[PDB]
Design a protein around this nucleic acid. Structure first.
Lengths: 120, 51, 41, 126
RNA sequence: UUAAAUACGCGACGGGGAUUGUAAGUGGCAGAGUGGCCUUGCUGCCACGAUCCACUGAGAUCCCGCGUCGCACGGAUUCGU
RNA sequence: AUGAAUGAAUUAACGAGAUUCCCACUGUCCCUGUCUACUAUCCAGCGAAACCACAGCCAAGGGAACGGGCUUGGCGGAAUC
RNA sequence: AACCCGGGCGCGAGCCCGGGCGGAGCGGCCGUCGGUGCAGAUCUUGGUGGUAGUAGCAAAUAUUCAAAUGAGAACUUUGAAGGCCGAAGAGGAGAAAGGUUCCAUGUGAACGGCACUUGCACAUGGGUAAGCCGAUCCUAAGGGAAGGGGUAACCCCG
RNA sequence: AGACCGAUAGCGAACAAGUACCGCGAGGGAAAGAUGAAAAGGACUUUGAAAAGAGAGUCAAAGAGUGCUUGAAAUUGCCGG
């Protein structure tokens, strides 16, 4: 999923990731109070597709668990998601995130640091 | 219990069951004449057993 | 016969009037039998 | 295809347990498929790829502490206290205790010797 | 009916009101009761603290915004005298 | 045009039996609103019947006296949801 | 011959030809036979259009994310997450009834009111083992076998 | 044997016919024929989700290609006026 440059311009790429917050509320409140939880999962599967610019999206089981944990009638307001993004194929991989409580800022930085660490 | 037992209905039911098999690939071939759709061949869901 | 069979409350497994106990799997003198109440509607 | 439906019947009837407790690994899928026989299933159960899941838990714990929460009174103001009036204990259930005790006391009292045969009849009648 | 690298454009942050109303953690004791301990004695302690106060006009925000990050460089289809 | 075992009268208890009144309450009502759910709608797939001599505008009139159509008047851009 | 298309005659019922198709039977005159002519009968049977790509596939809110396998995956199968069933709106054992529907392997024209790799669809193989379970033996409303007698007799009481 | 019928006719039944099927039962009860002179009954090759399709082969003829003589009507598509 294109963090595709290629070529450009900065950004020497194929995969990297970004952390994005998916707001469940707007479409979620459109689903039923009992039937809410499946809607969220779809919401996530549509937003990443939009943001990422790719049709092919993978959502991690972790994400499934997160939405479902409260149950069917309760879904979290939002969920931070780590969405990684590589290939000519241009496919999306997503999973859950972490946060004390805070901000949107430079999530790209942590990822860049991870890839740099992997190594020898 | 048995599973209604008597040999005398029980065998004849088993005979009709052996009798309800496909025609044997061969009798289509030597053959005289027919779209050989056998036909007295009976089914667990539909129509109903007789004696 | 008026005794019918005894059916186990745990396993739910049917084992005689002469057998003392159930044994379907290790039920094994669990003694947790009740007879067939001997015929309804 | 892989049809795992038959190992699920077999798996259940050798862990002597349900089909939603019996679990089969997603690495071993071909080897599981290859088992066609219980003696093969038994081997995969022995070698621990097929396994009987534990599966949430109880609630004895709230309830036994609920019994310690009766031990020890509580909730015997009028409101929380309720099935119907007698049904809870018909008082014939307290009589079944009282009537056996009052006659057990009267038998102990004679055999220690405290009362006469005349007094014993009257009180037993009393 | 809208906007589009000829743009305060979108998402994510949060600042505003106008939204609802006292958090999680933390302490005290009006107040339950009960037990043991420390000490010459006096005296106090610990324990399991039912309920309350205290640190708090806290958390959440179908509405509204300026400071960062990410994406916004695009093309299908059509034909009229 | 009541009337005594074609039973008369009378009457406690009982009753998904018939009629009436009161309090309680309430959206039945003043008088309607918002909201949920499943439908609806749109998409992929599956896929029917009833019915069908008949082309299928209105106002009048006429006619076996209750016309989608004759007669005179008047109107109509089709097709489609 | 039949059929389709047209050309000619006859008011006309109907006659005739030309072209194509078809690929074996077909007429005319006279004299006779007669299952001898339809638009219709809420006519019969068969086929077929519009109705229509329309109604139904809607109330237990039930799946979702990864993955297997596969020419093909919303519905086959694994895991996780999430629910639902509770005297059984979906647990266990059985009577009747069914009648092989069971197991396995291989398929996929039809079914499943959709997909299907699946199946209780199709095909081929395979499975049910009793001295101690049940049948079996007994006897209960009664089915009665057995005089005599009505009744031709069927048949019926005893 | 025939001024009989000739596959909606003649028997209900030209064939797998009192079959398939219906009814608890007594009883009820269909639809169902035709490649070609000869199987010569569609090799070999390309393709494809499957069937099938393309190309070619046999024959006087494949719109003779398997419920395969002829092939109306009612109807559908495409197309021409």
């Amino acid at each position: 999923m294109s963090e595709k440059k290629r070529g450009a311009g900065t950004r020497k790429d194929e995969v990297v990731t970004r952390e994005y917050t998916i707001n469940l509320h707007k479409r979620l409140h459109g689903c039923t109070f009992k039937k809410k939880a499946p809607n969220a999962i779809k919401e996530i599967r549509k937003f990443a597709q939009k943001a990422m610019g790719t049709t092919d999206i993978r959502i991690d089981v972790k994400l499934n668990k997160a939405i479902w944990t409260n149950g069917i009638r309760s879904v979290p307001r939002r969920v931070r998601v780590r969405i990684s993004r590589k290939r000519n194929d241009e496919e999306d991989a997503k999973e859950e995130l972490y946060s004390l409580v805070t901000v949107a800022e430079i999530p790209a930085e942590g990822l860049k640091g991870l890839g740099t660490k992997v190594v020898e | 219990m048995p599973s209604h037992k008597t040999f005398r209905i029980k065998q004849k039911l088993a005979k009709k069951q052996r009798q309800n098999r496909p025609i044997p690939y061969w009798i289509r071939m030597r053959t005289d004449n027919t779209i050989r759709y056998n036909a007295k061949r009976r089914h667990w869901r539909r129509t109903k057993l007789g004696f | 016969y008026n005794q019918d069979k005894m059916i186990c409350r745990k396993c739910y497994a049917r084992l005689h009037p002469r057998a003392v106990n159930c044994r379907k799997k290790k039920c094994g003198h669990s003694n947790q039998l009740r007879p067939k109440k001997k015929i309804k509607n | 295809m892989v049809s795992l439906k038959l190992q699920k019947r077999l798996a259940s009837s050798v862990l002597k347990c349900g089909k939603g407790k019996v679990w089969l690994d997603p690495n071993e899928v071909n080897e599981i498929s290859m088992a066609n026989s219980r003696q093969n299933i038994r081997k995969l159960v022995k070698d621990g790829f097929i396994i009987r899941k534990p599966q949430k838990i109880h609630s004895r714990s709230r309830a036994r502490r609920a019994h310690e929460a009766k031990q020890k009174g509580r909730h015997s103001g009028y409101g929380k206290r309720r099935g119907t009036r007698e049904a809870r204990l018909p008082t014939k259930i307290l009589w079944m205790r009282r009537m056996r005790v009052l006659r057990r006391l009267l038998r102990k009292y004679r055999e220690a010797k405290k009362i006469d045969k005349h007094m014993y009849h009257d009180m037993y009648l009393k």
